[PDB]
């Protein structure tokens, strides 16, 4: 009995963060750090007591933890939480990212900072909730309720140098994309529930009972397509990626909203836990389309990243390319590629968190994000260009970082399944090296292209530097020793893979 508290602790922490605004302005950051550390420590405790390295795949459903309480008993809707290895890896990841987001939004001495913390913990608790829910209506509810806090802290707390109309436009674009796709998912969920009620007589929203739903191929294809469109908006999958670079660029300039909301992909988890087990035949027929969309995402995100003059838009397009790799991995049906996708999700979260935090620090140092306005920043800053070099090397796919482990394990499994897509994706890795070196040469190398790049910039604060170094250490540990992560996710990955391949 810790998953209900795993979702409740961020909510109560954000509520009391808003409540303690009367006691000061420097107060709610400490409460925010306390509640995020509490959530992270509880997730680490459930990891340490879980014993995921010694459990075998015994057939879906198989959870480490489970909880059920009737919420809307008229519809058979209940708060139904559960956890296994992959879900626990995701919740530990968002706990760590939320701690980093709180530590990144430090020294934001301003009025209504408590509401900013309240929105941040609503987003983080919502991400934890969609990672933990196994009731379909409850999962969709958690899926759609990050939207109001994210919209409000993009439109009201966003990039202050830009016009307020631009932030409002980006927030409305993000809201419309994600909420329309969520409504499509709700239609698919309702149709699945009604189909199970007609074919059996039992009315429920439980995921474990909706798995054995006899239906025609076209109906299953349509349900899978609704789920896939909902996940493809948030993955992002081209051409539904367009909300992401403007949402990143109009995010608050601290670089905490990116970590809190975007930089963990609940869409890959949603595909793995719902698109493959509920609709395995439809996913099997849909696999070539998703794989070619992933290839297009890889190369289009690479070309988009090379063309930017903004660093933040460049990093957003790198995220698009990496998620194209993950989308190829998910539909292979290969255990090796599934584990590589899990490693790639975690490594992408860490590396993109480091890139966005460094970009935010650079923007606070030089008051611009235009790459034509700088150059030669290696001789002006003490820590930022070398850490940026490390993180560009990491998202380049370099061995010694976890991105290489995830990417190449994806490519090994995919080459066992689909060789041509794997070949094209490895040339996508060449494209990744091209855009990473282009960003490094434009930002930190050469001569100064303006007057702000010709001065000795201020150094790095110790808290920012230490959490960047923590991300560096975690990425290096993932690259050199990914075995605890694989042993954690192996049982859930094997159960999903076996349910996917034994149903086709």
């Amino acid at each position: 009995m810790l998953l209900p508290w795993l979702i409740l602790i961020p909510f109560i922490g954000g509520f009391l963060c808003w409540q303690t605004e009367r006691f000061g302005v420097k107060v709610p950051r400490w409460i925010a750090l306390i509640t995020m550390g509490l959530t992270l420590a509880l997730s680490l405790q459930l990891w340490l007591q879980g014993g995921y390295s010694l459990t075998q795949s015994a057939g879906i459903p198989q959870w480490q933890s489970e909880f059920d309480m009737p919420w809307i008993p008229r519809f058979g809707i209940s708060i139904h939480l559960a956890i296994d290895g992959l879900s626990l890896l995701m919740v530990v990841l968002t706990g760590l990212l939320g701690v980093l987001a709180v530590l990144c939004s430090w020294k934001e001495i301003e009025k209504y900072q408590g509401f900013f913390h309240l929105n941040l913990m609503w987003i983080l608790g919502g991400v934890i909730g969609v990672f933990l829910a196994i009731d379909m209506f409850l999962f969709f509810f958690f899926w759609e309720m990050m939207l109001v806090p994210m919209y409000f802290l993009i439109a009201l707390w966003g990039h202050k140098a830009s016009d307020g109309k631009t932030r409002i436009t980006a927030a409305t674009k993000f809201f419309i994309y994600t909420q329309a796709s969520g409504l499509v998912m709700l239609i698919a969920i309702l149709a699945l529930v009604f189909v199970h009620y007609n074919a059996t007589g039992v009315w429920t929203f439980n995921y474990e009972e909706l798995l054995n739903t006899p239906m025609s191929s076209g109906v299953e294809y349509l349900l899978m397509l609704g789920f896939f469109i909902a996940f493809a908006v948030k993955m992002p999958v081209v051409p539904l990626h367009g909300w992401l670079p403007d949402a990143h660029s109009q995010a608050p300039t601290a670089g905490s909203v990116d970590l809190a909301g975007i930089l963990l992909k609940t869409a890959a988890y949603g595909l793995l836990r719902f698109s493959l087990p509920l609709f395995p035949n439809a996913s099997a027929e849909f696999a070539p389309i998703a794989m070619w969309l992933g290839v297009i995402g890889i190369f289009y995100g690479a070309w988009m990243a090379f063309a930017q003059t903004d660093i933040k838009r460049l990093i957003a397009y790198t995220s698009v390319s990496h998620m194209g790799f993950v989308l190829i991995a998910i539909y292979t049906g290969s255990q090796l590629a599934y584990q590589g996708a899990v490693i790639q999700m975690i490594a992408h979260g860490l590396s993109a968190a480091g890139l966005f935090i460094l970009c935010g620090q650079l923007y606070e140092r030089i008051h611009t994000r235009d790459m034509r306005m700088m150059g030669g920043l290696w001789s002006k800053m003490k820590w930022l260009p070398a850490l940026s070099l490390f993180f560009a090397v990491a998202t380049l796919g370099m061995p010694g970082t976890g991105n290489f482990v995830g990417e190449f394990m994806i490519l090994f499994g995919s080459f066992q399944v689909v060789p041509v897509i794997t070949v094209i994706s490895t040339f996508g890795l060449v494209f990744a090296s091209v855009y990473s070196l282009a960003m490094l040469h434009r930002a930190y190398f050469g001569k100064a292209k303006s007057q702000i790049a010709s001065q000795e910039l201020p150094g790095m604060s110790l808290r920012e530097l230490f959490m960047i170094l923590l991300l560096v250490v975690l990425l290096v540990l993932l690259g050199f020793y990914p075995q605890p992560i694989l042993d954690t996710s192996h049982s859930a990955i094997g159960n999903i893979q076996q349910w996917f391949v034994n149903s086709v």
Partner: protein, 592 residues
């Protein structure tokens, strides 16, 4: 022994300490840390070799952990040592230590001293990992690290945009080669189920009994990776265009680590290459072709660094030819001797650059045989080892062993390619030294001056039991010495009216300009890869997919603006619209 992990860890410790130093230490302290870490690696390598020869040269394995274990996918973090690994490790550590000593002398009063030594220490660490890995994925780790360190070292003077452009070009070309190598790794795991070198060699004949297409694909992609790192065809432009970095960087890349990685990859995977004889002969053809183009391009260059770069290209082509004609011992021996004399030549070139000012042209300067006798003598003996002066230099013996391998295997085209390559090598080498030098006793200079003579030929690589033994010799020695001597005499005779008469002729000027442009491979690669990349990037700088997905918002705005015209505020129109809707409802109900 538990000392191979020491040879990895010590340069890693040096890199980490000097990177986190960030230049706050003194020059002496940073030099002590970097050069001491590389020298400690060399001393541990020497003790490893002593222990290796103390036993019966037995192969030793040192596992550390399991890198990844997903089902049947078991990649281990293990090191292995045999004669080939010992030879490559000794060459890398010793030549890197000498280059580190010369760089500590050479980088005095330069910004980024500790950054330079951190990058070179990570380079040494990456190549030690490359030569000691027992499986292909750990070797790929070392491969990628070596490429990244070469990128960081070529663009060391980052303020000059040409240096960064050269470094970026080298990194992109080598990354293409490593993508070919990744294809080889994927094929070999998908077929054999393992990436361990000994296990792949043991499992290949049993698995590839019916079909042999996938093994040929894997060996072709291994050759693609090898020519990616060793700067051969068709991935060769980076070595020519990336000498903008410092001279010890060039010495390290050309002698110690970077270009010898492909030769090591071919030699280590010889068991897989022997099952695909067509791919091995293709290695030989690639080496011979790169030999010819490098030799022809080296004569028409007007810079010392570019001439030395194409010399490195030609000698790596010799090693690739030796691997193609199954002269593995000759290939590794030529690797060691070429490391010695090319490191010596780059050290002497750096000394003559420091003696001159601003790195001037070679044509306007001359008569340096009196001002600087020591650099002239070092350059002369390095060229003699490069141009194979008989019975006085180790390069003559190494090229003689390569040509004997070409003799014994019955290959004619590769034989004549090697012979005219030796001739062309003699002409361009003695051309360059007689153009520059006609008309302080540093310890590394003396060390690789001694090692460029027959004293370096006395060293025998312990490849017995690791690489297969190579299968008229007097006549071959006589004709090789004759070819080298007539090349020396011809280059002494010309280089100055006949050379101007030949060069100023329109076919002669056309050929000189064609061979100065790396046989047009830079232009060809630009027009087929770099210009269309920039064209597609410019075509896709405004996100067309985002605009096409934003089209429904435009449609919604247009439809709303059109619908708002009916709310004109006229009561009579409201009554008219009510009656129109009544007509529509009544007609629809009567139709159905």
């Amino acid at each position: 022994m538990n000392m191979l992990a020491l040879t990895i860890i010590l340069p890693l410790i040096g890199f980490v300490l000097l990177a986190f130093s960030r230049g706050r230490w003194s020059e002496n302290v940073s030099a002590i840390v970097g050069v001491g870490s590389v020298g400690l690696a060399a001393l541990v390598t020497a003790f490893i070799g002593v222990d290796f020869f103390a036993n019966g040269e037995q192969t030793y394995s040192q596992p550390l952990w399991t890198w990844m274990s997903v089902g049947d996918f078991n990649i281990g973090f293990n090191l292995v040592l045999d004669g080939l690994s010992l030879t490559m490790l000794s060459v890398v550590t010793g030549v890197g230590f000498l280059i580190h000593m010369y760089a500590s002398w050479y980088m005095r009063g330069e910004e980024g001293y500790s950054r330079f030594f951190a990058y070179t220490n990570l380079f040494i660490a990456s190549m030690v990992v490359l030569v000691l890995a027992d499986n292909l994925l750990l070797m790929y780790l070392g491969w990628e690290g070596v490429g990244l360190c070469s990128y960081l070292l070529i663009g060391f003077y980052y303020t000059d945009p040409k240096n960064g452009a050269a470094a970026m070009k080298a990194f992109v070309v080598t990354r293409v080669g490593d993508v070919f190598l990744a294809f080889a790794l994927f094929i070999l795991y998908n077929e054999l189920g393992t990436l361990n070198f000994r296990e792949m060699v043991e499992l290949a004949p049993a698995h590839f009994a019916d079909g042999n297409n996938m093994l040929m694909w894997a060996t072709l992609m291994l050759l693609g990776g090898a020519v990616g790192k060793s700067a051969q065809l068709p991935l060769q432009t980076w070595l020519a265009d990336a000498m903008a970095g410092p001279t010890p960087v060039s010495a390290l890349i050309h002698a110690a680590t970077m270009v010898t990685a492909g030769v090591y990859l071919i030699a280590r995977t010889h068991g897989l290459f022997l099952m695909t004889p067509e791919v091995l002969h293709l290695v030989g053809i690639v080496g011979a072709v790169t030999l010819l183009l490098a030799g022809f391009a080296a004569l028409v260059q007007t810079d010392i660094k570019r001439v030395l770069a194409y010399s490195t290209m030609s000698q790596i082509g010799y090693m690739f030819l030796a691997l193609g004609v199954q002269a593995w011992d000759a290939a590794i021996f030529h690797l060691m001797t070429h490391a010695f004399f090319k490191a010596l030549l780059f050290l002497a070139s750096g000394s003559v650059i420091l003696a001159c000012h601003h790195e001037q042209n070679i044509f306007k300067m001359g008569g340096l045989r009196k001002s600087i006798p020591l650099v002239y003598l070092c350059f002369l003996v390095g060229g003699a080892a490069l141009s194979a002066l008989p019975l006085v230099t180790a390069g003559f013996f190494s090229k003689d062993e390569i040509l004997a391998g070409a003799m014994a295997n019955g290959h004619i085209n590769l034989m004549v390619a090697g012979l005219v390559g030796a001739f062309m090598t003699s002409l361009y080498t003695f051309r360059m030294i007689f153009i520059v030098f006609h008309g302080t006793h540093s310890l590394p200079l003396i060390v690789l001056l001694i090692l460029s003579t027959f004293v370096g030929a006395l060293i025998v690589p312990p490849l017995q039991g690791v690489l297969p033994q190579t299968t008229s010799m007097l006549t071959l020695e006589i004709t090789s010495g004759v070819v080298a001597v007539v090349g020396i005499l011809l280059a002494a005779w010309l280089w100055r009216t006949l050379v101007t008469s030949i060069a100023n002729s329109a076919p002669g000027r056309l050929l000189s300009t064609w061979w100065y442009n790396a046989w047009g491979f830079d232009w060809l690669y630009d027009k087929v890869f770099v210009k269309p990349f920039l064209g597609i990037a410019w075509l896709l700088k405004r996100d067309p997919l985002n605009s096409m997905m934003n089209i429904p918002a435009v449609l919604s705005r247009f439809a709303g603006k059109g619908l708002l015209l009916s709310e004109n505020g006229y009561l009579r129109w409201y009554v008219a619209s009510m009656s129109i809707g009544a007509v529509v409802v009544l007609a629809l109900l009567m139709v159905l």
